[model samples]
Target: QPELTPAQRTEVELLARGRADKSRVLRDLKLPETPEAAHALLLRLGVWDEARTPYADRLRAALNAVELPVPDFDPAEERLDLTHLPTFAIDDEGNQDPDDAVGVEDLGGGLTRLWVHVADVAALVAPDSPLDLEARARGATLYLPDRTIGMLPDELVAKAGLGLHEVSPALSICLDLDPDGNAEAVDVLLTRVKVQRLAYQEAQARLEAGEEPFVTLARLARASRRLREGEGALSIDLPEVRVKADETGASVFPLPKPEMRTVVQECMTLAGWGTAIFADDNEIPLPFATQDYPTREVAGDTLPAMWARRKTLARTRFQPSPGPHHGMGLDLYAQATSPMRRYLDLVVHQQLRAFLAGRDPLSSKVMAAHIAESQMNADATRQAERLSRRHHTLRFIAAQPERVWDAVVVDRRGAQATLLIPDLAFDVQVNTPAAPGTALQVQFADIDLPQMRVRARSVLE
Candidate 1:
């Protein structure tokens, strides 16, 4: 390791403590004016974050300046008691913040009631408070390969997160639907719920065993999904890769989305749609997500076709008024689930609470500004996550230099083609005379971890 000079050591100390800003550190130490250079220096000094970039750390530090302890909530408030309901949260095995849970009950006479209970984060974090401001600035919880940067503090998430055997406060959305999965009535209630937590594998096992409610829920999910598809909703089933680095080393693997997860997703979508309608009918200015329809039918059976279709789809937008979400085929959509993970979801919750209390809600202008700011921050967070995953994936490939990977060509420019290695979530350039949709075997020729760059050559020859 290179030894640091006294001035360099001092600057590192200041930056480590979050006592000084990056600009000050850069000017004081006469360092380069970019995070890349700063990150190199920190790595040499053994102060680097293995899972994230220095920019993410600096932004988190800036937001941490106003961080406060989780606020307390009164139990005597007008929260309904729904602990009797058999609600449960299903998520990834290692997921910590179980923010959403679901329960289904037969209402008899061919009607079933589906309940989606989300953590009531707005109940504790009021608007414009220090915690609220910090959360708004952070926008969303960032999930990286090895770590998570939560929008809310850990203590707050623990307090509000719907954990197993824990009776937690929640914002419940109940939809009474017929046997064909058509909604007959929708109701929103602030309640306390005792939840059971299940991992995806466990839930999938129950479904296979024809467990009570799971089978019925699956039936409802399929019916609801078919309805959405009929309305032009596009379902893209692309593979997802998750990476992790630890003491043993680094690893990359596929993250499966079990069929049970779809059941949860459909239920949440219904709740979000219901919330959108509720806000519209009550004259509340809830931020809604909208998107333009695709010009062509989406393809997902193959990697190359899926990539082409995904690139052609329009970007989703957040607005203060009602608009169609072409991707979801919803006339209107507002995300209210995962308030513990997303700032916009928390805002939606706050608006709903205000409307339920007969108070004046946030103005459309105010909601628009918040949505704009939150979306910007969310975009940055997403980029950080993407880069982090790519970095680790590159590292994984670097570990095995001679291994060949199956790749599909997605596009071509002159003699060069862009190849996507679905297994590693990697896209690289290769000088190959292959047309789009052609499959080829490739080996990594160069992997630059520091610069997050990769070059692969066709091994077919």
Candidate 2:
């Protein structure tokens, strides 16, 4: 079992059973399932209470005060135009979950095209809602394969608001630049764009065929890969298995290597880096996301002591003003993409939309409070989802008594390492070093799918 920290333990005791301020304790730690619960949480956090209006209800009231300038989609109508070119969205098949995808392409010229469907973000949180400003405090959405408790809802994520080529309108975050790998300038607009959803495998084949080859795309892809590797990107080579049911919705299977996924990720990272720097330069509003920096406690071969390794980096936090996100290696990285699946993306859209339209942005104080709320919501979602998936994986392993697998260590601390076994593969978070190439034997140590905690112990090496 995971031991609690002094602060965590104290908090736990508050909600334990009998306490002087039991009501307050329960109010602070309770799982929020309804709007009322959410409102109560905001009260405990000091953002609002009975004396003050709830943020959500207040946000509803503030709709009239907030004005979002309709994003201009016509470039010729502005100054520069890049819409007159061929563009495509290479995403997962049906699983791309139409409601959450944006597209990028190699426009025949020396330029690359970025496509953001108009309604993509608007469909999630209503424009005038408090969530519009609150969401941006969070920079991105968190997704766990084994369990996916998304930041946004299923309808917003799978259909209505996102950029799926033929059906909906998209807001594009278009970046135009030369072949020298320098982003000349960036522009944002709303337009009805189309994308041809092709699997990564198919896209790779088309790319290699030299037929309608995207030269700018190919060149930039190579450079981006090299840059990441040069920056200690940790090419750990750990494989991930996706278990999704097919058309019949019966048996789920593992996907092949994620080719298109990699390309799409690199491009988005590229755009995100640009936005971060752009906002930072102007001292305009921006949200930043980061990963835990490597600490002395998390380095070396003895990294397999996570729970025991309590000396690692602290959990990443968000600031309303501006700062660097050391993990993704960007100075001002903010998520302006993927609004359909993430609640925070909507906030980002509002910030960008408001700024573009010349409206007063959220003050630093207000932004800070919004960031805290967004973090709490996103983190709670993550904790619940992780637990659910871990449970599912354990059940799958339990049924395969005769299967043996290879595992790689993704994290280590104290005296334990969290391993990523190939599907039906190897060991996971255990008190042993299951390094990339290190071989180990695993047996079920603990299983509780509902709570998402499954333990595997090392039997042999």
Candidate 3:
């Protein structure tokens, strides 16, 4: 059948819709309509038997368990070693959540390495405690405008994340991909490492501006580009919008990029790839940012053409057994990059270490379901962040000049088009998904932002 079973469809819809009532979704899917059956369906999506509670409330309760203390940066010259080389901090002053960092630098190993720094996150989520390490297995902390819930606790991800200049604990995956671009016979190794604070956007600009030659960082970027192009890694050039506020949680605005964001991104990808290959070679079970291989009619031949005019169907699932991470166009890959913000990364880190220590990684269908549940929770937390940002952005963009933006043509059809401006972060409005990027002036194309509603219209030339 073209559709999945009722139970399967219910779970898939929950993921697709981002969240929904398990009972109603189950009944609509034509599955067992009982609460018992509904609970089973929820469990499949990685929920516990007590999954009846609203997902958002469950997430908040998890956070409350840790008693996270807000971070306070010391203006004093609190320094650590690594002064032999330059160091800087990469964080959002507006960011109240502890999470992961991505940067590139020369590591004196004749090659530049990509770095993903986790701020104090690891110290909070490790196993051997009642802290429910499952909550921290998914990798990467997500930030939307209003809320700043982390993948782990502030003590774990923020204070304990492998942040700058701290003699912090870290599990680093170093990959030496190809200088020609595409990831090479990738290698992954777990090392106890320390990171010096190197401001992300600022450092990227300095490197590009001839302030100083960043030999290794440049090479790593080159390698990432090559791998991405060669591997058919789908470049979904989505826009990024950042909402920021003062320390008191008032007076928020959209944070702008400092120009070097691209450079920093390349470095993080290479490190992620390195970890992927490491897991692949070692036969370790690690979490990957995976998407199911698209059907022939869906992704077709070319990347852009595949989704250019199609209704993007979304049904990505997590697997305990390693599978092709088609979304990234890799044969086998996993993420160990941002253990600070992601529960899966922490789990991946732990698994990799086990494999490295001559022990086979843990494997169980039931446990995989548990891992998937935590991943879903992390995903839910991210969606909340997005909702918060939409609310904040509505406020920030309200009553501003309703002018046309230099937009890019991302997707188009016969009826409407979509547009994006560099100045405006990722929230592309599909006006006439048909006539997007025509460079015409527009009005308040978006629905009310505060309500997190959006609808766009085009200005006829």
Q: State the C-alpha lDDT per candidate.
A: 0.79, 0.50, 0.50
- As for lDDT, the candidate ahead, 1 or 2, is 1
What candidate 1 gets wrong by more than 4 Å, as runs, is: 1-52, 57-66, 295-301, 435-437
| Model 3 segments more than 4 A misplaced | 1-65, 68-124, 133-144, 164-166, 177-194, 209-213, 245-260, 295-316, 356-360, 364-367, 401-414, 419-422, 425-434, 445-451, 454-460
Q: What C-alpha lDDT, on a 0 to 100 scale, does residue 275 get in candidate 1?
A: 91
Worst 10 residues of 1 by lDDT: 58-67
For candidate 2, give the lDDT of residue 15: 32
After best superposition, candidate 1 residue 221: deviation in angstroms? 1.2
Q: How high a TM-score does candidate 1 get?
A: 0.88
Model 3 lDDT-worst window of ten: 49-58
- The candidate maximizing lDDT is 1
Give per-residue CA lDDT, model 3, range 171-256, as digits (tens).
44444434445433444443233444444455665667666434455556655665665766655544454565443342333344
Error of 3 at 302 (Å): 14
Q: List the residue pairs that clash in candidate 1.
A: none
Each candidate's clash count: 0, 20, 41
